[model samples]
Target: ISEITYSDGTVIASISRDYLYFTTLAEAQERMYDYLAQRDNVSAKELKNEATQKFYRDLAAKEIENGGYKITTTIDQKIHSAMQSAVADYGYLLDDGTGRVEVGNVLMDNQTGAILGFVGGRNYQENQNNHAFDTKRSPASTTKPLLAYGIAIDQGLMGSETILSNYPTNFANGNPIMYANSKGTGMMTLGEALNYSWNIPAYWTYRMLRENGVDVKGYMEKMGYEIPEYGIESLPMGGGIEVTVAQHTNGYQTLANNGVYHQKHVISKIEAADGRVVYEYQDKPVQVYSKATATIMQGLLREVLSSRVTTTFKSNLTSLNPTLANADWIGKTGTTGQDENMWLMLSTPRLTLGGWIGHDDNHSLSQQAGYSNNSNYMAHLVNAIQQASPSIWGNERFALDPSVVKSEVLKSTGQKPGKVSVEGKEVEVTGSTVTSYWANKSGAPATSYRFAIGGSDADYQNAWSSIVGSL
Candidate 1:
């Protein structure tokens, strides 16, 4: 009786005697266990009670005898097909010819918090690991833009171009926080750091947040994010945390909804066997960030995609696909476990998509010759959808609020100033220092600060050392 359907009342996946016939005995049993366990809000282990187990078993048998009920899902057939075809057509990215190479994709409607489509894995009949919903693996660096930048932007602490030192530092536990690239970009804005995917700057940002009495871990938990034992360091880099495709993709709704978080769900409504509507998703939007803050964030993320304008300084994410050169989208690429896991978080105004490529054995992707990374797969998936449905996927964009001003500030500690001005009005500063950042401004307060840079050499060197040491 438990079935899922799309918002438009379209049927996707259903359970029936005929459907069960396609699965193996073991898979069918597992499906039954999952269904009943979820339905009764009990674990499979608790179903050890023979009476309870038989009760559900008999119920399923009766349903089967009467031609099992249907369960509709939120999967958009076009998107789902495009995803499957992309993986198969670009199978080389996942084909190590070893055990099993798995991939998962989940797309959500940012406006309504509805799951547009989801692919648990390739050939669910053959492999049972539903990668789309499995949260046992780390999301890798994908954690940065969503958690780190989102929090900072919302708090008005920093802007997209805020300068952060990219250097090495030691945690309280003595673990060296280093960047992915051994070399540091002497001084770069927050936008550039994310565009380049440098680790040191992200680590520094995380540290600054914690030093300011920000409860990074507690904040994440409130959003349903699971923190791993990798400790506080993972906060910025996404090391120890493990998140399911559903949970991770759901986080993006906040960013797309102007900082309002809407609970994500695959099914719109459910009906009982008696033909009465049973239950439905009834979540209200919860404000997680100010609308202006969210607007600024979307603009910042656009930097991640547009930073690829020049080949010399293009981000690694840019190499994912050529179509992205002209595509209007925002996304980030993540790798963890020595390239054992590859993840992508992509979004346009129409869709928020999260995907991953990994091996069941947790082996490094580098182990295979052609499988250097998952970018190829992502590229193909994005391009395929674009080619099939050009109108819908093309020219998509995030809504930016006009009030969220985009201004550039000198990357300095504000120790000295030529003149203080806002909207062309001259202002006076009673006192100022590099550390004070222009104290006592008389002009109208800034509507928003888009970017800043310039800091102590010590700050820069520490970040540089961290990047170098990691290499």
Candidate 2:
């Protein structure tokens, strides 16, 4: 230890070990503080890891507390059995079916973010050296609904009643039709196009996005697309994209969670044997969309289960008397040139579920001459999953508030309502708002209306239904 007196007559203390070290006492003290602060942050990650583990442990304990259900992966057998009974006709969903791989299954309390038990999926290619089934691939049209939904909300496009011209739309192949495929064509609204999985409508909507000069690329990044190429040009029409079941689940999860992306974590809190919140995932959320968009999107997405109109269930979906036909859920079906995917995003006040199925290779698995019904089969799988999973797994239900601070298209970021038109040189806007005074040349309806306060569509959809419900 050395005591040194400086010109200012202030003495500083220095302590040294045999290894040798010297510093002003103030420097040593500051260093100690810095070390402690760094340790605290390190401890945070450690505690987070620990808390996550313990949270799962506690959830397991609570679920088995009453000695009712077994808390283990074996429970999947029971779930499978139940699902089998639910989809009796669709025997293709046998637990022992081919090309089946579950990435993760969680029985979560939707509101509290509690995980009862998590079971990793069985290896589909057991004989192969590699567990190739879990390997991710480019989930094709499955990615479409999210983009469509998000863009719709960002632009105040329409509600369930917003009408779109119902006609055969040649989205990619340039085919045309004169009749309504699912919903009527007299001008099917945003809500009608999405619920029915109308291809032409989705494509035209993207066209509308470009027409508005909206930054589709910026919106995708903001929505967490993680584009490897980085541009809106790739995003148009769901092209040049790569996504997975987990990402698909999460995309809808953000919407289901009222446009707030809950940081992905399995554990909520950890106790160190004794009761203490040694770790907890703070309720920090990334607001990816406005409440209005969320709510309006929810309403729009739920169109698949609508009974008022004939939807594209392909006959097999409604085969199961109650599960597919009457089960309370919302979902979308998807297909592309070489791939197929289906998503069933379910919710009550208590649970929200995202279920999916597909192959990593863009090849079809069916031995049937030309039968490859991945999306339909996956839909049946989801229906069975919901009915079979134990009751205690899904318990928390967060109610959405209709009056929460709603999200608006950040106008500064180049987002706006309605689509602009430019046939040659003349420009105009269309839809509910923004008058187009194009000298009545560009299909202008003179004296167009602007959005009225509180009358604009989906002004408060997200907050109104945000009770954390999941499946």
Candidate 3:
């Protein structure tokens, strides 16, 4: 209600407005209109809270549409059209006559953060609600890399072979947080834990990051997500945060581009009908991780889709086999409690693409989609897209950073393969070996006799490979 004024009659500051609440009314505001709100195909009624689609209606009021504006976008027409068609052909696999499962997809140029394509819903006429960007859902395990492992690596806290306790984890209340298997995988390396999408290891890694003074929440915000409080014990496992498909894609985009986080957008430029430029888009790219951190993370993600292990029976993922086998791709899978949400993020060097499949009301995917592998549909869909146009979605790989060096470690000990002379002849230590990427700064473990087993390295390696097909 009052303002302090200087001797020169300049009001220095005001404190009355801070205590009282106020808001603008429609009468005092300028009214605007949008052409897309009246149309259907271009995501018109994207805001439907059971009845009223008000968000877009209100948001569009101040935006331009049919005002004769020329728009230039970074979206690739061919890729967008092809991806939409692929969604149409594959969406039926998620519907078991229930019509409950819905899909949200976004394809982006990972290096540039350009949204090349998206599929809000396959049945466009039936539901104009755009799930890709408008809908927010719990990210689940899709965030493991972003929330825990990747940040830890960038902070120089852990590497791909860093050992994490996968033993049973407990909450502050003394209750156990059960993993998918109801048991732990013992002490596991970061690479194995992430490759298998294990919950316990991710939680342990997250805790260590916090103990070492890493700002986990800051990384989430920088990756284009907003979270509640940081008290959630399972935050690293996607316990208490929500994100849109586009936001999640940018997180992975950061990894795909070897640590550069580019802000995402669909539109690039706007111009008046008179050919005069009105606005142009430019993203402020930030380096979210070190090149070594990102390269190791990318290598770890690739293990998820690698052909070293593939399932064939009762799974359409095998369809991806013929295509992904040769493609330089990487991805991860995510599922919430009781399969309420099926999520996946599949990306190639040219672009990053994937999304979530779930019911509008969070119905069990098992009962609705008939199969819990609902996210598995994304693999086949991408396989189809690339098969049709291999040129555009070409099998490409991001260049490996020089700082990321590979070393072989013992699967049992998490130590580098080693050799030592005991009494006379040199003995080699090489049973159950696994390869891991490490940052040069993190310094891969030293080779020593402590990991030595009494046998020739070649025989043990050959035996392990024959059992699992690869190490």
Candidate 4:
């Protein structure tokens, strides 16, 4: 082997014949400060042996090596049947033979959920005609979980134990709490409030946040959330919001992925049919939530969605289907007032799925029927997806296993769970901001993260004139 003179930021690695090299980052240089303390106990010969051992040890590093055992499980046949059913139920063809009804906007991960494909409303013209309209639609209700739940946890506002009242109240939007003619009334923990989709509860959570001296507006902007001209008035209730199918997927993914926000990808690892790794997903994800926070949120949502809700807004289709009843799933539904638009976002244990619907003429589909922008129609679409999308997730196509970690664990170091000195005594943190990344809070560790806006690549750095729909 040729003797190599590595830089101060270099590492020597040993592998038989085939070689692997590694380097040290500037952050690791601090080890040198303590190197002298242990130097006296080592002789030149021993030090050389240790160096050689360290070189070989690099081969076992987690990033560079796969575990000895490989996963051998295969997708079950039921998944395929489910996908076919979903497609057959929802896939459509336009009256003209040339124009077919195709899914307009959707983002799904099988490992997260079984949403395969979708159709109807807004995108049929483009799906049947235009091949160049690869634009992202404004995501309406899908932004709720991340902004409401995920962001709440990341900010240390509340936790699995924090309680939030569900009683009816006016929001910053200047509207009193009510569902249709019914007055909103109840008390629920933060987890229950989100699962129940109580607009008042969710709004008050943010409202109280400002009263408690936290900078809700500034923090939301940091996460690419636009502060509406109405400011906290509208955003606190998930109104005045717009996102994309991909952006929704990205946000849900952050919740599923232990708070680390990875850039959402359509293709996993591109391989030639002959078995060549042409493109691989080697990018590191940015940590957006602590593992504990992320995991707790997941468990909580699962409990809420899985529970039976006797409301029109809940997933009644799933209730009618036995196959979907037993599966690990969670989702949120939203509708702009007057039933002008509908939004449904759901996730299986391992995949994520979402959709949007409304009339091109801007007419309400079911104003008198109690189905708003987010309603039973969304639930129907979700059920249709459950019937069809599974085919693409099973044997003939790509499949993923979702039976890994079940709950949250400590996966980051920024904010450990415990009490610390505040003023004169110790105060306990029910939850903690994983990073001190507030706009006004100084002394935060710098980090880079993935951001998604209207589906394509999110353009947070420049003006969003390229985005469609209303901002």
Better of 2 and 3 by lDDT: 3
- lDDT comparison, 1 vs 4, better candidate: 1
What is the Å distance of residue 264 in model 4 from its true position? Answer: 2.5
What value does the lDDT take at residue 202 in candidate 1? Answer: 75
In model 4, the Cα lDDT at residue 154 comes to 53
Q: Best to worst by TM-score, what's the order?
A: 3, 1, 2, 4
lDDT of 2 by residue, 263-352 (tens): 433333322223432334565567676665665555555565553232233345566434344443444544443333333344443444
How many steric clashes does model 2 contain?
32
lDDT of 1 at 358: 81
**Highest TM-score: which candidate?**
3
Q: Give the per-residue lDDT digits (tens) of candidate 3, residues 1-471.
A: 222222222332321121000100111111222333444443444534433356545544334322544445555545556766777787787775555578888888877897766777666667655678767877888888888888877776556776666655577797776765476545556766776677877776777777778787777777778898777878877889878888888888888888889998765554455766544566798888889888888888887656222211123545566555456677776777676776778777777886788777776666323134454567666665566556655667766698776777777555666664433656565567767676666455754432211223443343333423432
List the global CA lDDT of all models: 0.59, 0.40, 0.63, 0.42
Model 1, span 1-471: residue lDDT tens: 333344455543444222112222223333444555677797768788899887777765454335433443455657656766776577555666555668887778777777655656666557767677653677877888767767766555666445666544566687765554364546666667787777776776665676677656655665677676524666667776788877888776677666777776654544456664433457787777667667767776777656652111123335544555455566676778476777777777766778777877888765322223355565666666665556545456666665464443433421223344433544332222222111011211232221123234576445434433443
- lDDT of the structure predicted as candidate 3: 0.63
Best by the lDDT measure? 3
